[PDB]
Symmetry: C4
Subunit: 269 residues, 4 copies
């Protein structure tokens, strides 16, 4: 929604193919511009068909890349001035292009799967709100933290209606090494802000649930971040996640992420 262009860094987020196309285009265009500049000055390039855009272009190219074959060369003090300018550009351009590439290499995704739903069901004798996460890569994430946050609408003494945030208590919230799957659980005890709440009351308060995940990925040697929001619709009351850890034919332990979004539910005549 509205608040009251060069700084467009789509450059960092777009796909590689697209990124290479933009770099490539910006590189053709900049040579197009220099070629024109040279033509503006006349025939200041030796050995170039007069007035020819082609030869002026490839001349630019060999100047900017610094290939400098030496068949085409500049003659004006005008040409040598542009050459000097074009040399700086090729240098800054490389320097920038490498900047953008190195960066793009270091804003990696978390590779983290969130279950499509939450459940509320008994664990250790209390109703418990749960969801789960999976590491989609072989590399491990170390010092993983997760937060499960309720956002709902509440009323102050002064009568003002506002969105309140509650960081829900988790049986475990820091995993020091996260490699496979992690079931995140919030025991709904007397202290829980959802204690006594039902699907209907959660609807009324416009309740939502955010999960936020952080950790240091060994795959990138840099911290990663992932989050997901759940609406009330997406809580299965009485659901239990299906085990994703299973034993193989041999007796090898296996993780089967195909079961990951599956939830068992009791059905009554």
């Amino acid at each position: 929604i509205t608040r009251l262009d060069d700084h467009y860094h789509d450059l960092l987020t777009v796909s590689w193919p697209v990124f290479i196309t933009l770099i490539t285009g910006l590189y053709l265009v900049t040579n197009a511009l220099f070629a024109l500049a040279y033509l503006a000055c006349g025939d200041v390039i030796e050995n170039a068909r007069p007035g020819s855009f082609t030869d002026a272009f490839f001349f630019s190219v060999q100047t900017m890349a610094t290939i400098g074959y030496g068949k085409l060369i500049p003659i004006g003090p005008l040409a040598n001035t542009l050459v000097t300018l074009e040399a700086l550009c090729g240098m800054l351009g490389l320097a920038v292009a490498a900047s953008l590439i190195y960066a793009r290499f270091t804003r990696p995704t978390a590779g983290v799967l969130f279950s499509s739903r939450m459940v509320i069901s008994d664990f250790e004798g209390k109703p418990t709100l749960m969801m789960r996460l999976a590491n989609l890569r072989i590399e491990q994430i170390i010092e993983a933290d997760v937060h499960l946050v309720l956002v709902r609408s509440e009323i102050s003494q002064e009568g003002m209606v506002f969105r309140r945030f509650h960081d829900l208590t988790l049986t475990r919230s820091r995993s020091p090494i996260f490699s496979l799957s992690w079931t995140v659980m919030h025991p709904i005890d007397h202290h829980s802000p959802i204690y006594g709440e039902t699907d209907e009351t959660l609807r009324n308060s416009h309740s939502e649930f955010l999960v936020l995940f952080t950790g240091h990925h060994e795959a990138f040697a840099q911290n990663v971040h992932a989050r997901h929001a759940y609406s009330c619709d997406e809580i299965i009351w009485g659901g239990h996640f299906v085990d994703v850890f299973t034993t193989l034919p041999d007796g090898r332990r296996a993780l089967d992420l195909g079961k990951f979004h599956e939830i068992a539910q009791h059905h009554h005549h």
Copy 2:
């Protein structure tokens, strides 16, 4: 009279080559580029002269010409090496060698600076020009607000609100001490619009019982640090601001920050962002 300036920096006076580094880091792009270009012309000027102190060691060059020895240099340092101009003396060939190293060094350094500048984005966080004290949940509460000036979100954001005032110890020493103020909420999971940060003034507050007058006499200021992970830049940002006593409106309340556009949509009117309601007495 101000110990911290609004932007959080110190107002005190400090008694007690490497400057142009942290300098290429902080100036604007136009200036950064200009300086770089400058350092590049100058460097070439120098070598050109170094070739002219050698006499005529550039074949195909007009003798004593700066122009020609300067375009030689450029062509050498950039490594374009067309071939018309070319070194003759072992003297010229040694300069070429050195000049080649400088351009290679020059590139690396310039690439460093460019990348570094790319990795220090501003937080783009707005601070309300004032704080207010007024009731929240039946308690007087010190508040200030923050807004995100970009469309991308800052996540895992937190804020610290700190009192700084002068106090007198039992030993009769006067000194400034920091108090971290407990907030009703000091974290924002997704900071995308506006955020009213709040310090209930309860029994535990260091400003419990305090008035405009008593804050003034202790030289009380309020310092705020904000930090978070900017998704726009995939990196951490931080922002700071400070307020003096003057900038607390006792009794005021921040105004609804939203507007209605002709079609019926809702927009954040950051024009209202610093607006404060007060009761006016008959």
Copy 3:
């Protein structure tokens, strides 16, 4: 039988272009270089061929020669541009253009990978091959030790020791649960030699009352994460290790790790580092 391998990685089987990236990051220097060289020869091979599909668009080149069109390419892509060999067709001149872009891209990428590899040093931390349980301050205490393998120090170091075992819930579900074990000390300000990490088995311990036998039956493993700031590299490092029940010596004690050299000096004998004393009964 092992859920975690010694090096802390998972032993489970997983069901459910971009590989050669995280790959140039992890291989050894020799191999990294070889691959890079390879990708560089190959790339040049390709362009050379692309020039030969054009016929003879390289002046001064022996017709149909790969050798010559290959050294053309090299000279173009590296931007050496001597001038003997040179493009003739607009076809040749377009390839040159493209080839120039690749070398520039190729450099940037190769510089990225090199820098990235420079910024992922190993922690150089050694883990003792076993844990022991024995008395510290009159309490049975689970211990393991760590050593720094480099002369530079790791500062602001901390360690986490975690139990993983199988448990049965009230609802009769079996599941593996992590317990973070409280340590007598989980931080080391300057980690420079050796460090015995310790978990007193007190009333609060999840292994209070546990025996070799009961740990075995719950499939108990112990997982350790270490982290710190390596001064050698001015960056953060981390290290992990895991132990099974087998690797607890009940009753053992780590042995003094130091030695005496002929002159009388003292040296850390990392040869003793994994040694464990036990009482042997008559």
Copy 4:
């Protein structure tokens, strides 16, 4: 002391002048080597005095830097092979040199002054162990943490004598913005491990005190780290630091770091 070479990264720590000298030397030597290689093959460089080291060197130089004037050129398939090799080296060499420079730029010092001494003296009615720190740069350090840690020798029930670490409680240990001077204080209360200790007892236990400092420097946009150790000798019992904050002629507030290591002490006939 002893434990039981290429990986020598002095490259990162040495002074710039020294660093540039090593880069420069490594660059001369590598060209020296290529020049020899070319000579090994005979006269495979056109336009080079036969057997001449000079011409073979500058040829190498123009190849490795990729200046390629084109007077000197290769002729063998041998020369063109070395050229191909030398091109790769210049590329890797630049790539490495830029790596080392960028890194060196990002391992900045904290610029933090530690007082040369500690004091123990009354603050708010308790004896208090103190020392102080100063930011030596105009830029601020944000989220500064300090730790004050006692290391002394102690005896276990089992009789074993070992170094114990105590992280001392500070009146303030996190400063959210650190710009000038910070007096770090540990109240010696009933809970302090130095409660009841004297200079003599601290000597006996071989007590030392570490200060460790961390924060994010705005000057570098990267975290910095500094530490200092104090022996017993360096505690002035009864000392009070001299105020470094002062008023100027005008009434401007000033910080005078010249007073920074000064401690007031009472003297008795």
